[PDB]
Amino acid sequence: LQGTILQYVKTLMEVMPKICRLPRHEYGSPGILEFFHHQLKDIVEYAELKTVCFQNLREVGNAILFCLLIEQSLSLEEV
Amino acid sequence: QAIKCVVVGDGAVGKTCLLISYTTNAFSGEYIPTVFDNYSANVMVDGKPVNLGLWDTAGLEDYDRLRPLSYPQTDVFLICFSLVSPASFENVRAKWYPEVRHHCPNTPIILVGTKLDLRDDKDTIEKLKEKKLTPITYPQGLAMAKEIGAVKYLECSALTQRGLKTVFDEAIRAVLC
Amino acid sequence: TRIRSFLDDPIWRGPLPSNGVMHVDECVEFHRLWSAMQFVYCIPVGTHEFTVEQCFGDGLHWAGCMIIVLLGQQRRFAVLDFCYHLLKVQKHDGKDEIIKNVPLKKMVERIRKFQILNDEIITILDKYLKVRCFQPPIHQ
Amino acid sequence: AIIGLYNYAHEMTHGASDREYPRLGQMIVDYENPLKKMMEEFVPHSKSLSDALISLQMVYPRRNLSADQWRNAQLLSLISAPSTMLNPAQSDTMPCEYLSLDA
Ligand SMILES: Nc1nc2c(ncn2[C@@H]2O[C@H](COP(=O)(O)OP(=O)(O)OP(=O)(O)O)[C@@H](O)[C@H]2O)c(=O)[nH]1
Ligand SMILES: [Mg+2]
């Protein structure tokens, strides 16, 4: 969390739009989707998001899931 | 009490910066193309409360199909052209007025002029002379406004805020009257 | 609690809101970044490439939801989210177009599934873990 | 039937009808179409009734707007204007804002 993930989050924050407000319903779903894609276009082209950050996130989620599952098993054994 | 004001014009003219400066008295230098932006402002006109619905529109050519989404049920149009770019001066009559008429034939138009502070600045004037172009003058603005039918043509600068409130003060009056 | 304590960098929460209540427009909070991640990996990928679930499954979503919950932004994330707003608008209007090689109906269905997963994860996290007064206006 | 049975029993037990029976019977036999009779009984009160009713022209029509108007006006949304989140919502007629529509 304090290492690779922190650096990647810091790097991604800079490229994020300075201000982004949800568009009104009058524009419609297609225009809203186009606006969101244009605003977040730079994030989409980024390649390391799906190979390192995602991987790191998967590593932190599996660890917590293993912690939760181990506890339940322990409880069952104790019962 | 509700007013739907839509602001249109060529790209890189100051529409978004104009709206931001008017609404929050803040100015920025960076240029960022916009697709949809909505700003709400409450003003006292003739002692009558009014809610201003400001709708920014993209000036880039790659959003013509996506522009008319904000046109319906609009009260007043605001066409803005840079004072240090004759390109926008021509593009106004070229596209903006006919498009507004096609999509809105009975709506008032308030012609506006941006970059007033740069009208007399040196570096910009010699840079424009390099291309054999000159800043737009008051008589030309009035001539174009009366040619297209705009009921009022004004000046404003998003930096010095000179003539900033009047722009919107006349538009509310245009619909109220 | 230990994982929450590990989060000490100011980047996670950002500066104080200008309006003095909460961030709405500015994207200085991690929840907006997570929403952007959801938007990018919710796009239906081609047939010759793997999806997020195939490679990462639910670990990525669990980690993101845990981070959001520990940062106390689950309500803000639910209220402020690009995918959720897009799905709501699509449901309200009901339109389907190929906007930039991206089907709309499939994308909104994927968003529906992902928010269903996220809601359950956030509810579970909240179930395991479990003011500011403003002044009125003064006459001038 | 109930009124008549009670009156008859009272007369039989005491020899005289109930003191308030005649007025109740007159009211009952007069009110078979209550609206039709009130349209004539309310003539003296018509001026006051119309004066009271006309005052709702500034509240009711604006409170019966369709969902499209509410969506346009972004009714009941805190996040529509974040710079004014601390401003206390208020109006010149506070009670009329939440007054029952069916009423
Ligand atoms: N010095 C100076 N710069 C200005 C003034 N008005 C606008 N600008 C700058 O001109 C540039 C273009 O203005 P913007 O309003 O951002 O462009 P826009 O109207 O949003 O254009 P589109 O997004 O393409 O629709 C920006 O860098 C502004 O800061 C002004 O009065 N003085
Ligand atoms: Mg713009």
C58 touches chain A (CB under 8 A): yes
Q: Which of C93, C13, B25, B36 is nearest to A20 (CA)?
A: B36
List chain B residues with CB under 8 Å of A31: 36, 66, 69
| Resolution of the solved structure (Å) | 3.0
Q: Is any Cβ of chain B less than 8 angstroms from the Cβ of A78?
A: no
Give Rg (Cα) of chain C. Answer: 18
Residue B156 three-state SS = coil
Nearest to C69 by CA among C125, C13, C24, C21: C125
Q: Rounded to whole angstroms, how far apart are CA atoms C64 and C81? A: 14
In 3D space, the residue among C52, C8, C44, C38 whose CA is nearest the CA of residue C115 turns out to be: C38
Sign of CA dihedral B121, B123, B124, B126: positive
**Ligand 1 atom index nearest CA of B13:** 19
**Angle CA(B155)–CA(B156)–CA(B160) in degrees, nearest 5?**
140
In whole angstroms, how large is the CA radius of gyration of chain B? 16
Work out the burial of residue B22: count CB atoms within 10 Å of its CB; fewer than 13 is exposed, 13-18 middle, 19 or more buried: buried
| B141 marked ligand binding residue | no
List of residues 6+ apart from C88 with CB closer than 8 A: none
For the CA of B11, the closest atom of ligand 1 is: 24
> How is residue D88 annotated by DSSP?
P
CA distances for A26 relative to B103, C74, C93, angstroms: 16, 27, 10
Cα–Cα distances (Å) from C8 to A6, C5, C13, C70, in that order, read 11, 7, 9, 11
Q: How many whole angstroms from B82 Cα to the centroid of ligand 1? A: 9
Which of C 61-90 lie inside 8 A of A, CB atoms? 61-64, 66, 80, 82, 85-86, 89-90
Q: What count of other Cβ atoms lies within 10 Å of the Cβ of residue A63?
A: 14
- Count structural domains, chain B: 1
Which residues from chain D sit within 8 angstroms of residue B40, using beta carbons? 80-81
Question: Is B13 labelled a binding residue?
Answer: yes
What is the C-alpha to C-alpha distance for residues B85 and C21, in angstroms, rounded to an integer? 42
Ligand 1 in contact with B151 (CB < 6 A)?
no
- Burial of C27 by CB count in 10 Å (0-12 exposed, 13-18 middle, 19+ buried)? buried
Residue B70 in 3-state DSSP? helix
B5 φ/ψ sector (left φ>0, alpha ψ -120 to 50, else beta): beta
The answer to whether residues C128 and A64 touch, using CB atoms and an 8 Å cutoff, is no
* Bridge partner list, B56: B7, B37
Out of B13, B20, B116, B164, mutate this one to test ligand 1's pocket (max ligand atoms within 8 Å of CB): namely B13
Residue B76's DSSP bridge partners are: B5
As a whole number of angstroms, the distance between CA B74 and CA B55 comes to 10
What is d(CA C92, CA C98) in angstroms, rounded to the nearest whole number?
Answer: 18
Q: Which of residues 22-81 of D touch A (CB under 8 A)?
A: 71-72, 74
- In this complex, the chains that touch D, judged by 3 or more CB pairs closer than 8 A, are A, B, C
**Residue A69, Cβ density class (10 Å: 0-12 exposed, 13-18 middle, ≥19 buried):** exposed
Q: Is B58 in the pocket of ligand 1 (CB under 6 A)?
A: yes
Report the 3 state secondary structure along chain A.
CCCHHHHHHHHHHHHCCCECCCCCCCCCHHHHHHHHHHHCHHHHHCCHHHCCHHHHHHHHHHHHHHHHHHHHHHHHHHC
Chain-chain contact of C33 with A16 (C-beta, under 8 angstroms):
yes
| Experiment used for this model | cryo-EM
Q: In which domain, by residue range, is B134 found?
A: 1-177
To test the contact with chain B by mutation, choose from D69, D72, D85 the residue with the greatest count of B C-beta atoms within 10 A, namely D72
Q: Are strands B36-45 and B48-57 parallel, antiparallel or unpaired?
A: antiparallel
Going by C-alpha positions, the residue among B5, B137, B142 that lies closest to residue B71 is B5
CA distance B48 to B74: 20
